Every structure is written in structure tokens, then in C-alpha cells.
Amino acid sequence: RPKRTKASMSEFLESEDTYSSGHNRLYFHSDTCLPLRPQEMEVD
Amino acid sequence: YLAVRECDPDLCLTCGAADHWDSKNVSCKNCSIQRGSKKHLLLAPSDVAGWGIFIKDP
Amino acid sequence: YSFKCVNSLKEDHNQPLFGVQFNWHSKEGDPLVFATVGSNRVTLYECHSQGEIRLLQSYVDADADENFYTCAWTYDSNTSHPLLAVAGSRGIIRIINPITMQCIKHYVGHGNAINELKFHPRDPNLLLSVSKDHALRLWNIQTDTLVAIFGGVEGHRDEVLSADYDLLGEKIMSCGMDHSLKLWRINSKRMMNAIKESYDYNPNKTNRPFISQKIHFPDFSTRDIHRNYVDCVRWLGDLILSKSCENAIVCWKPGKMEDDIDKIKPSESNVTILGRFDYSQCDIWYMRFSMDFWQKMLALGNQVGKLYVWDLEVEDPHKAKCTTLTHHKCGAAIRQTSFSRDSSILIAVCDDASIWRWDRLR
Amino acid sequence: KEAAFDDAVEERVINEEYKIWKKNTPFLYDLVMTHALEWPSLTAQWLPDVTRPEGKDFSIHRLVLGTHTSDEQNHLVIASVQLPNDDAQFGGFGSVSGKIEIEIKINHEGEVNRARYMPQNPCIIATKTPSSDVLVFDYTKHPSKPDPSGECNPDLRLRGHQKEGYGLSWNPNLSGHLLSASDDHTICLWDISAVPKEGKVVDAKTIFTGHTAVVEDVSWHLLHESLFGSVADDQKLMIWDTRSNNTSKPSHSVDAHTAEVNCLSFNPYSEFILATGSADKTVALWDLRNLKLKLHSFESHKDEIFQVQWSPHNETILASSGTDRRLNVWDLSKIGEEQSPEDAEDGPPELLFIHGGHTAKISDFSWNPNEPWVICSVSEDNIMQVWQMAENIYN
Ligand SMILES: Nc1ncnc2c1ncn2[C@@H]1O[C@H](CSCC[C@H](N)C(=O)O)[C@@H](O)[C@H]1O
Numbered sequence: 001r002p003k004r005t006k007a008s009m010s011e012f013l014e015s016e017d018t019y020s021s022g023h024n025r026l027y028f029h030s031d032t033c034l035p036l037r038p039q040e041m042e043v044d
Numbered sequence: 045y046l047a048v049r050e051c052d053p054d055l056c057l058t059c060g061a062a063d064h065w066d067s068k069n070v071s072c073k074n075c076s077i078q079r080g081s082k083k084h085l086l087l088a089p090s091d092v093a094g095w096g097i098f099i100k101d102p
Numbered sequence: 103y104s105f106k107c108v109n110s111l112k113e114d115h116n117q118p119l120f121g122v123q124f125n126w127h128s129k130e131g132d133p134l135v136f137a138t139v140g141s142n143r144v145t146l147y148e149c150h151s152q153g154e155i156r157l158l159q160s161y162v163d164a165d166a167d168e169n170f171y172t173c174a175w176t177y178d179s180n181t182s183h184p185l186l187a188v189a190g191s192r193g194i195i196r197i198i199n200p201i202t203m204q205c206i207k208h209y210v211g212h213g214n215a216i217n218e219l220k221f222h223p224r225d226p227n228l229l230l231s232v233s234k235d236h237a238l239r240l241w242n243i244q245t246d247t248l249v250a251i252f253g254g255v256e257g258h259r260d261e262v263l264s265a266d267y268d269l270l271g272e273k274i275m276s277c278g279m280d281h282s283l284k285l286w287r288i289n290s291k292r293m294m295n296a297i298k299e300s301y302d303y304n305p306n307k308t309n310r311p312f313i314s315q316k317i318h319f320p321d322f323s324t325r326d327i328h329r330n331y332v333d334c335v336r337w338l339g340d341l342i343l344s345k346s347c348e349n350a351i352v353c354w355k356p357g358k359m360e361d362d363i364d365k366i367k368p369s370e371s372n373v374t375i376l377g378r379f380d381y382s383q384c385d386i387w388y389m390r391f392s393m394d395f396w397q398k399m400l401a402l403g404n405q406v407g408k409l410y411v412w413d414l415e416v417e418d419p420h421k422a423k424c425t426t427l428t429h430h431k432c433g434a435a436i437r438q439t440s441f442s443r444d445s446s447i448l449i450a451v452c453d454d455a456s457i458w459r460w461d462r463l464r
Numbered sequence: 465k466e467a468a469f470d471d472a473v474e475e476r477v478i479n480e481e482y483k484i485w486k487k488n489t490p491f492l493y494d495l496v497m498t499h500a501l502e503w504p505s506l507t508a509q510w511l512p513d514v515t516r517p518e519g520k521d522f523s524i525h526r527l528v529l530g531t532h533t534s535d536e537q538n539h540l541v542i543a544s545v546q547l548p549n550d551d552a553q554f555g556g557f558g559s560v561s562g563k564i565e566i567e568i569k570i571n572h573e574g575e576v577n578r579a580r581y582m583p584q585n586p587c588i589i590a591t592k593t594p595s596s597d598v599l600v601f602d603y604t605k606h607p608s609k610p611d612p613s614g615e616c617n618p619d620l621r622l623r624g625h626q627k628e629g630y631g632l633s634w635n636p637n638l639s640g641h642l643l644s645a646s647d648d649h650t651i652c653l654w655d656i657s658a659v660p661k662e663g664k665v666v667d668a669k670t671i672f673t674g675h676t677a678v679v680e681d682v683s684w685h686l687l688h689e690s691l692f693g694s695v696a697d698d699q700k701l702m703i704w705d706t707r708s709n710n711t712s713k714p715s716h717s718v719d720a721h722t723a724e725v726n727c728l729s730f731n732p733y734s735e736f737i738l739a740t741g742s743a744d745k746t747v748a749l750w751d752l753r754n755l756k757l758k759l760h761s762f763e764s765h766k767d768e769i770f771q772v773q774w775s776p777h778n779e780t781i782l783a784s785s786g787t788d789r790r791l792n793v794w795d796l797s798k799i800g801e802e803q804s805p806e807d808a809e810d811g812p813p814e815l816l817f818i819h820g821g822h823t824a825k826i827s828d829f830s831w832n833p834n835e836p837w838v839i840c841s842v843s844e845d846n847i848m849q850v851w852q853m854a855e856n857i858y859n
Contacts, residue, residue, distance in 0.1 A: 001551030002494055002854070019556035027086040027098065032248065032314060033211050038502075039309035306535070 045074050053078060103411060103425040104463040105448060108153040110431065112456035117141035119451050120171055121219075122440035126395055127177045127184055127226070134442055136449060137186050138457070139170040144188055146200070149447050155459060159200060168192040172219035177226045189216035193233060197243070209241055211248070217263040223271045228297070230274065232262045238276065238286075240314070242300035249300045250293060250315030257318055258282050263388075268337040273321065273363070275342060277332045283344075284320035287364075321368050322356055327375075333387040338397070338414070343377065347387045351402075353377025353419070378419035381410045392439035392448070399445050401427075403436025407452070409460075432458045478789075478823050485821045494551065495838060495852035499564050500845070503538070505529035506576055508842045510832035511542075512586055521553040522546035522563055525832060527840065527848075530576025530591065538575060539610055540591065542568035542603060547838070547850065564848075568603050569610035573618075574628075582634040582642065582656065590622065590642060592632055597665060598622035598644055600656070620659055624652035624668020630726070631681045637689035645679040651694050672711040674702050680726040687735050697724040701740065703755075718755045721746050729772040733779040743768040747784050747792075760799055764792050764815055771828060777836040781816060789825050791841065793817035793853075817853055 027036050029044075036044065045051075051074055053061045059072030068081055083101065090096020113119070117140050124136035135158065137146040145160040163170070168191045176185035176197055183201040193212035196205040213235030222228040227244035236259065238252030252274075253262075260280030267274060275285045288294075296315055303312050327344050334345035338353055340363050345351045356363055357372040383406040391402035394414075402410040411425035435453035442448075448460040489496055511526040525545050531538035546563035574594035581589045588602040599618035606617060622644070631645025640656030652668035659666050675696035685691035690706045694714075699721060702714030723744035731737035737759075741747040747762040747769055767788030775781035785791035793816035801813040811818070824845035831839050841849045 001548075001554065001557070002490060004854075019560075021560075021562045023086070023098075023100075025088050025098075027088045029311070030087040032251070033213070034248070034311075037309070037311070040311060043309075 050074055050077055103413070103427075105411070105427055105460045106463050107429040107432075107450075107458055108461040109149075109155050109459035110429075110457060111147075111155055111157075111459075112454070113140060113143070113145065114455070115140060115143060116455045117143070118169070118453045119437050119455055119457075120169070121173050121390065122392075122438045122449060122451050123173050123175050123186060124440045124442050124447075124449070125175050125184060125186075126443040127175050128443060134447065136440060136442070137173060137175070138440075138451060139173045139188055139190075140455070141169045142167065142190075144170065144173070144198070146186075149442070149449070149459065153459070153461070159203065161198065163190075166190075166192055166194070171215070171217055172231075174219040174221055174229065176221070179226065187219060187229065189219055189231060191215045195219075195229075195231060195241075207243060207246070209243075209246075212237060212239065217261070218265050220265065220267055223267055223269060225271075230265060230267075232265050232276070234261050236260065236262060236278070238262070238265070238317075242297070245301055245303050247300050247303045247312045248314040250296055250317060252276075252286055252317040254316050254318040258284060264333050264335050266335055266337045269339065275335055275337065276320075277335050277344070279331050281325045281328050281330070281332050281346075282323055283325065283327060283332075283335075283342075284323045286317060287321050319368055322366055322370050324371060324373055326373060327352060327354060331387045334390055336393065341376070345391070345402075347385050349382045349385055350380040351377060353379075376419065379410075379412055379422050379424070383408065389436070390438045392441045394441045394445045395443045396445070399441070401439055401441070401448055403439050403450055405435050407433030407436055409436075409450070427460070429458060429460075432456070481820070482823045489821060492854060493851045494854055495547070495850065497545075497547070497564070497848070497850035499848045501529075501848065502846070503531045503533045503536075504844060504846050505541070505828075505842055506532055507578055507828045508840060508848075509580060509828075509830050510840065511581070512583070512833055514832070514834050516549055520558075521548035521550035522558050523549045523835075525835075528568075528579070528581070528589065529842070530579060531572050532575040537614055538572040540568075540570045540572045540576070540579075540601060541566055542608075545850070547835075568608045570601065570603070570606050571611055571614055571616040573599070573616055577628055577630050578632040580632050580634060582640065583636060584639040588620075588656070590632060590634075590644075591618075592628065592630060592644070594628045596623070596625050596627055598625065598632075600666075617664075619664045620656065620666060621664060622652070622654045622666045622668070624654070624666075624671060625650065629678070629680065631679065631683075631695075633683040633692070635684050635689050635692075636686055637684075641684075641689070643682040643684065643692060643694070645682045645694065645696075647678045649673065649675055649677060649679055649696070651675075651679055651682050670711060672704065674704070674712050674714045675700070681728045683728050683730065685735075686730045686732045693728060693738070695720070695725050695728045695740070697726065699723060699725055699742075701725060701728065716755055718750065720748065720750075726770045727772045727784070729774055729782075731774055731779065732776075739772055739774065739782050741769045741772045741784050743770070745769070745788075747772065747782075747794075749782075760814070762792070762794055762814070764811065764818070765790060773830070775836055776831060776833055783829065783839070785819075785826050785829050785841070787825050789820060789822060789843075791819040791826065791829060791839070793819070817857060819851070821851070822847060822849055 051061050060070045061072050061075045086098040086100055088098050120139045122138045133148050135148045142163040146158040148156050148158055150156055170188055170190035173186055173188045176187050183199050185197050185199045187195055187197040189195050193216050195209040197207045198205040212233040215234040216231050218232035220230055229241055236253050236257055240249035242249050258278045258280050260278050262276050262278030265276045272289045273285050273287050277283050328346035330347040332346045336343040341353050341355050343353050354375045356366045357370050359374045383404050398414045400412045409427035411427055432452050436450055437453045438451050440449050446462040450458040508529045514525055516523040528542045543566040548557045577592035579589055579591035587604045591599045593599050600620045625646035626648040627646055629646030633643045635641035642654055644652050651672040653670035654666050655669050675698050677696045677698035679694055679696040681695035693703045695701045700719040703716035705715045720740045721742035721744050723742055725742045727741035729739045736752040739749045745763050745765050749759050765788050767786050769784045769786035772784045780796040783793050794814050795816040799814040803813045822843040824843040826841045826843045829839055829841035838850055838852045
């Protein structure tokens, strides 16, 4: 939900003064330090 | 389990430690290391420092 | 012996200089092109008469802030275009085609750094990149597929930096800071199967990636040759050269003097020492010598800037009639040397971005 | 070449734009969903049926898609998704378990050129395939699990087109009546309600040969079962009526634009309004009475457009997207309305909104009933995008 807070400089200047899911990053072949492919990502 | 000893296959006959040594799934949970029911892992560059380990399954 | 400095050029970057390479992969009458790797710059030149040297196309690694260490001339049979692979401290291989003016083959996977580069004498598509993590990996660049890896569980427990192919490409010597002398036989029945299969691979063929192999059992090993770091070994035919920081160069053969190199079992441990072409003023490693094309003439520089020169003829370490050529202007550190595809042109490179060409006085 | 070099530079650019778009996205969008699929799907559409669980903001919605792969088996897939009906519930809004998944897989042949559910029973669907026969399926009879044997059962599939093509439209009033377009320059019709146990393949009930070029779009009037029109690459569209004697002479005809046209969309509310895009960066509309005069034209898109749709619950809203990797929203009530110079420099008053949050080109975008303020969209990068605009733009 966007917070949609109203603009206020008295608070803004004074202050100035991620729900991911799944296998995000790429994984590598442990035996040989080589990048995996999703095709063989299961039997490995 | 209170002991540091894994229930020996020849002893925890009630949890099937001896039963189906060939099979992978048993009633017991403190018999795995003997059977080596390891989980599948993934190797990736860790966010913290260099290489790291990531788990494939929940 | 019949040599003198006739040319000398210095790079303006003042960075330490590294491995030199002369394009012996040429044809009769081709322009005589040689290459050299600096810190991050790569430069090529062609020797010319009268002592002139014409600077050729030169590049710089303006993206990777690393010191390049090794390079090796390359050739493509398909396009008949020569190339030259490079490597450095970041352990990444780049192969630039002068015809393409660029590198389009990217190869990574080594651990820390690369300290040796050399091609197979017969197949130009096979390369050994000795690495800092004690690893010996092989690449099939033509198929871009990896080939068997050497070292592993029973490999060198220290960083290897020096290795060599034999003349026919059948056994590969390896030596590192552990002073170990491990070699592996290419002709091993298993490998060429993989090498053949290395040339037979399609990424779209199946989900299963190519299976490069692993080796841990050299056909021989030892450490008695040197009590200090070894950084220069070469295949003198069936004989093995070896140089350390201890200001000596020694040639030796496995087992007894009558023992066949190819008959030696891995369990063997005996040594036959027949080399005493010793030197001095070069008590530090990371110096590499040069060889003539025909394996008849040895020239080694010096840290104090002199030359140590011997022939590969019947002249033997029984007396070791040295030829200590020297140019007064070069005394800082002779990092490497490089012969042409003949014995007429010698290019000596100093560390301080300066090179010193010596032409044969015949 | 420089073009290869510039494209490589362009690869950096699109990554930058997505990063920049992501940075500004939360303050301009009220919902941000993203999901990547194993194999790209050409088209997607919402199931009309919907259910909202009690005491749970996330609403149960179902989506149907196809499969496009390099060399593997393709499947017909139906996937479910949960979206917060209440945004007051702050595992950002719901549980950490995830709110999207796939439930149905059936072996598919080639790639889904076009597929839709027939309105009177969404369970039965027809799918345009690279093969000449138009395949027909109902997920109720077929198993949800994929069949690894590779066999497919296109029961009650449709014959009549010589080759594949694009363009599918069920009759909104007549059950089992659908118009399909093909590269055969012909429009074929079927009557599923009248289909017997003839062998699960149905020949074209009626074949039309009006357009000279490859007919690529054909649709029934959203209110009239008799009225329908077709759109082809001939840059000329023609209006048709059922039972009108010869099938090659249209009731009406007009050239939509100066380039190929492959997108047609009638207004569900206004009978007369019929929106027509074009490949010449131009989208327009026509009147059932006034065929000779174009009502208005829209040309904000920077590339070809071939997907157009009218917003549900919103007669004044029309959207279109294409190869420019941009989606343009337009306000009909704001056509020619005076605006501040800070607005004209931004866009025309009729231009409602512009969305560009996708690295890859989007081939399909689809809203759903009960949720007029969200749009699903399928890009080439297997990315499923669902997003809600701020209410502030429409007050
Ligand atoms: N949280 C942490 N922060 C910094 N260094 C860490 C660390 N956890 C482990 N290390 C270092 O990592 C070494 C363990 S081996 C693991 C190395 C690390 N995961 C990498 O790939 O780079 C230890 O010697 C320790 O010094």
C-alpha cells in the first residue's frame, strides 16, 4: 500500500538534517566453480 | 536424543533405525547421519563475504 | 654469443613489464610481430631492419585494474587469423584477434590469479592456465567447453607458477613454490576420449553440462631439485630444465640415466641430475628466460641487467662455457626475454617499462 | 557493426530505465506484482469467475496462459494469484508463503497464437496454434496435471483454416459461435453448441473471404450477435453482418490507417464506439454511423501497436501497448481539454496515463472483472506484471 503521506518540509528537512520469494541469485557448479543453468538445476 | 549418541540401528528398534536400512524415510529423526539423508544445497557468492551456501528447499 | 643490442624502446606508463611473446605462429615472409603485456596495457610491435621497431596496435585494460602476467600467441584455423591470449592477477583469460581488434572469448573460473599460459604444440585450441589456487584447468576454446582439470586432492599443496608442454604434447611438467615436480601424461588413454568429446558438445543437446575430468596422480613427483622457489622449467626434449632463485640452472631426467621418461611409473622417486649452467645476481624469482625456435640457443637476462647465454649444442655443463652479454644502459631488472622464430632477433624487456632489442651479430 | 554496438549500449539503457522506473514506481503505483515464468507465453487473459476469501485481503484470481519454448513440450497452463483487496493490511501485506502459483498443465502443440474462453462457459476454451486446426479444450474434463506422454486431446477442435493465424472472437450472444482469422486471408466460423460427436474436429461452419491480405483480427459486436468486423494487414477494415448472402462482400468498409492494422475493439457500453489501433504508431476509433470521418486519433506510442482493450466499469478509458515497450492510457472525456503548459509539455489532455515498467516488450495486457484499476501484462522476458495506478489521477 502506498503510504501517500502529505508533504511537510518541517519534518522533511529535519529528517534530512523487499518481499521477495524464490531462488533469486544465480548459483554455480560447486565441483568446478562454473555457472549452473536452470535446465539442470534439479538433478545436480 | 538427550544423550549425545544417535540411536544405534541395532538399538532403536521402535523407531525403525534397523528397519529398511536401504530405504531413506524412517519414523526416527535421530538416525539420519548413519543414513546420510543430506539435503540438497546451492553454492552462490554470499552477500556477507565471498562464496556462501543457499538451501534449495524449505 | 654473436649478439649486440641494436634497439631499445621504453613504454611511457612506467609500469612493471611482464611476459613477452613473439609470433612464431607465422608464415615465411610474414611481418615479424611480437607482443608484450604490461600492468594493464597490452602492446604489440614488429621488428625492422637498421634497428628500427615499428609500434603496432596497442590496447589497455581500462576496466579491470589488475596487473597482466602471462600471454600466449594464438591462431585460428577457421579464419586463418592469429590471436594472442592474455591473463593477469584476476585470473581471467582474454583472447584478442588483431584482425578483429578485439577479444570475444571470455573464460573465468580460476580461483585467485593466473601465472602461466601455453598452448598445445599441435592443437591450437587447447591451453593450460596454471593458477594461484594450485589448479590446472584445460579449456577447449574451439568448443568453449572445459576439459579435464589437474591437481586436486593430491596435487601441489602450494601455488604452481611454471609448467611446460613437451615437443609433441604428451607429458606436462609442473613446478611451484612448493618446489614440487609433478608431470602428467596427456597420452593417457582416458584423456583424448574427453578431448575428442570436448570437441563433441552442444549446450542445447541436453540439460547435462559437459563433464570435464579431474586428475590427482602425477606420473612422477619430487622436490629434491631445489631448496628455494622454482620458476623456470622447460622440456629440453626428453630432458627437463629447471631454474630456482638460488642462482643455478639444472637439467635432469627421471630415475636413472638409462630410464625411459615414458616408462617411468608414478611410484618412481629417483633423480638423475645433469645440469650446472649456474648464474648469479638473480636471487629473486619471477624471472623467465627465452629459447630459440630450433632449441639450439639459451639466453637468460639478469636482475642487474646482464645476460647469461648458452647454446643447446654439444656444449654441456661439463664446462658450461657461458656467454655473459651485457648492455650498460640496462641494469634495473630484466623481467623476461623472447626470441624470434629464428636465432637472429632477441628482445630483452626490463621491468621499468623499457625494452632492449639485441640482434644477432652473425 | 555500430548497430550491434548501439544495441549493446541499448542493453545498458533498458536496464537503467527499469532501475529508474523501479525507483519511482511505489509513489505512482498502488500495487506492484512481479513474477517470471519458465517459458514465455504469447497471450494471457483473466478468468471471469472470481472469489474473495472472507477476512482476507488477498483475492483469489485465476489466469490462463500458453507455453512457448525453444524445443521442449509446450503446455496449456492456468495459474492462480492472490491480490490484496484491502491495502490497509500490512510478508509485506500478507503471509510469507507467496500469493501466486500454477495449478493446471496440459500438453500444448507449438505456441498459443491466440486463446480465449467462450463467455457462456469459460471452462471451454479455443486456442490458435501453429497447426491449421484450432484446438479446443476444457480444463474440467482434462487432468490438471501435465501428461508426460506428450499426447494432447484437442477435443472438439476446429478445422477450416488452411494455415495458422491470429484473431479469435467468440460471439457474445451466440453460444458456440466464434470468428477466427488466418494467413489464408479467410475468416472461419463454427457452431460449438451444434457440434456432434463428429470426431472432435469441427470444420468451419462459415468461411469469409473479404480482406485481400492476411486477415489478422476479427471480432463480433459486443452487443449484437449479427454484427461483426474483421481487420487485416490490408490497412482496410470491413464491417460484416451475419446471413448477408455472399461471404466476401462486407456491409461496410474503410481504410483505418496508412500502415497495417491488426487491432479492433468495440466499446462494451457505447454501441457506436469502435476503437481501432494501427502499426503506424497510431490508434483511432470510428462510429457505426460515421465511417468516413475519424472521430479521433492517438499517436503517443513510439512504435507499432496491436493490442487494444476497453477498461471495465470505465467507458472513458482505453489502453493500448506494443513494441515500444510502453503502455498508454487515454481519457476520452479529456479529449482536447485545456491544460496547463506543464501538462501539454507532458502530454495531451486525452492521454490518461503512460506505463513503461518492463525491460522486454509486452505482447499482451489484460484487466479483469471486479478490479477495474489493475492490469496484468505479459512481456517477452516471461515477466507477469500487475499494478494499480494511484486513485489521485482519476480523483
Ligand atoms: N560474517 C563474516 N564476516 C566477515 N568474514 C567472515 C564472516 N564469516 C566468515 N568469515 C570468514 O570466512 C572464513 C570462513 S571460509 C568462508 C569464506 C567466505 N564465506 C567467502 O566465501 O568469502 C573465515 O576465515 C572468516 O574469516
